Amino acid sequence: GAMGSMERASLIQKAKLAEQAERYEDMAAFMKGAVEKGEELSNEERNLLCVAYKNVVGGQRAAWRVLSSIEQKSNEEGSEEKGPEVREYREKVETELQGVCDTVLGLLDSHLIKEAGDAESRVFYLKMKGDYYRYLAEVATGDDKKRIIDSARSAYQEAMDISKKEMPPTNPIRLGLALNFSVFHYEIANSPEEAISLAKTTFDEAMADLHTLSEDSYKDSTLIMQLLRDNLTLWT
Amino acid sequence: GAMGSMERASLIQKAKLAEQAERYEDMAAFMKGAVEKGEELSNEERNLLCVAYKNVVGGQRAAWRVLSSIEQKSNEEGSEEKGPEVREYREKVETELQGVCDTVLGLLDSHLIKEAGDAESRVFYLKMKGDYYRYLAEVATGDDKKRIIDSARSAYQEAMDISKKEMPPTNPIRLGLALNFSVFHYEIANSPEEAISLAKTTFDEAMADLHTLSEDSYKDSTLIMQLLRDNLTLWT
Amino acid sequence: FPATV
Amino acid sequence: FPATV
Ligand SMILES: *SCCNC(=O)c1ccccc1Sc1ccccc1C#N
Ligand SMILES: *SCCNC(=O)c1ccccc1Sc1ccccc1C#N
Numbered sequence A, B: 001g002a003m004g005s006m007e008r009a010s011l012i013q014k015a016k017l018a019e020q021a022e023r024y025e026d027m028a029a030f031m032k033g034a035v036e037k038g039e040e041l042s043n044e045e046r047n048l049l050c051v052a053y054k055n056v057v058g059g060q061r062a063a064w065r066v067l068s069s070i071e072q073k074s075n076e077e078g079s080e081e082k083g084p085e086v087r088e089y090r091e092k093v094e095t096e097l098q099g100v101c102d103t104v105l106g107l108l109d110s111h112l113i114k115e116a117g118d119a120e121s122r123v124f125y126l127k128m129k130g131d132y133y134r135y136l137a138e139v140a141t142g143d144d145k146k147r148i149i150d151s152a153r154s155a156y157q158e159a160m161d162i163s164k165k166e167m168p169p170t171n172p173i174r175l176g177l178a179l180n181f182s183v184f185h186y187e188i189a190n191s192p193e194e195a196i197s198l199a200k201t202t203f204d205e206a207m208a209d210l211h212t213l214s215e216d217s218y219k220d221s222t223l224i225m226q227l228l229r230d231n232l233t234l235w236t
Numbered sequence C, D: 001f002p003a004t005v
């Protein structure tokens, strides 16, 4: 790998510089190099990995949705035949997106998840595995689409089981996992009732635990609780 | 080149799709492929070329300025030594920026400018040559920095001479050229008085010609006149 | 789209 | 920064 000759600490330093410069592709390449050094990631370093790939794949998903919408309109009655170009370019963006997801899933499988023993790291990585299978599911249409969906579900479910056993209901990693698994139910699994039930139960059980928190922990937890409420407002 | 097998019309079609998806690196690669087909560009196609590289190099300049600022702060008294990483990463971004500028200048030299006979295309391309030498000048510090600055000046000057002879004072290409040459004077050539004089004279001579214009031409010209006024307000 | 983190 | 087009 092109980052093999750079110090782990220098890769982390440059990931933070890339974030400041809004150079998220660079940030992801630096964090990929850091993971491939083979040492476990700290809490801060896990955040940097999350931020880098969230921004990269988020831009790809946004672009894929624009192109897919144009493609759908071109396949409407009375639409003028414009040739293969829209499908080709949507496929190009889709293929790059799948490549990014496969890269992230590869880092989690080699070997972030198997070395993560603490609940905070293990739930973080398993949620991430669910997320990037979810992005693969968003563009999937083939023989393995159901298996891609079930790979997302299985990763999310394992993260949920651990988070319920090992973390308080206000833990931001637990809350963020529930937020995203709820979105998986709504948008991927055709299960809006499960999506709404999960978001509501997660919100209510966090509300009841806020009294235990410091001001700074309260801020983190209520921030994600508001995202749960926002989704519930969208869905009801 | 990787676009050699794709039809010119398909490259233009996908450049417009990439613009809709805000995929400006793709847009630039498609327009580079279109230019390399060897045919002259239409007015619309010149716009697409401008848009693609403006967005790509604009992001690189923004990132370079963030990193350069961090680097300057690290070289202040009482700043803790953090190692070579900031300089290395600034150099990396700087090198990619220079690569983009060299690519654009290469397209103009092979062979867009020499085949451009109409004032509208020739002024557009020569202004573009001035612009991308200006971006090279922004990061230049070596033996050829004065020569880079003079390459920008010379391209701008040739475009100005043609635009004054062949275009009305409200022509948007002429106005945009004067806007950017004025910025060259202010930010690159250490000539704020020339910058202000050019922006003011350009604004006043366009104002006096607006009465000749249709509503739609008036909108284009006054839009750029307001950019001249904005710069004048910044500078006075 | 719904919020995710 | 100043405006350019
Ligand atoms: S990609 C970076 C943004 N997301 C997260 O930080 C993240 C990742 C996994 C689970 C939850 C969250 S959100 C979070 C986590 C810790 C502290 C605060 C917040 C928030 N908001
Ligand atoms: S990169 C696309 C934006 N810039 C320009 O369109 C451009 C390029 C060269 C000279 C002037 C201009 S601005 C312009 C040109 C034609 C019509 C309207 C406008 C504007 N505004």
Ligand SMILES: [Mg+2]
Residues within 6 Å of the ligand: A091, A094, A095
């Ligand atoms: Mg495909």
Ligand SMILES: [Mg+2]
Residues within 6 Å of the ligand: B091, B094, B095
């Ligand atoms: Mg250099």
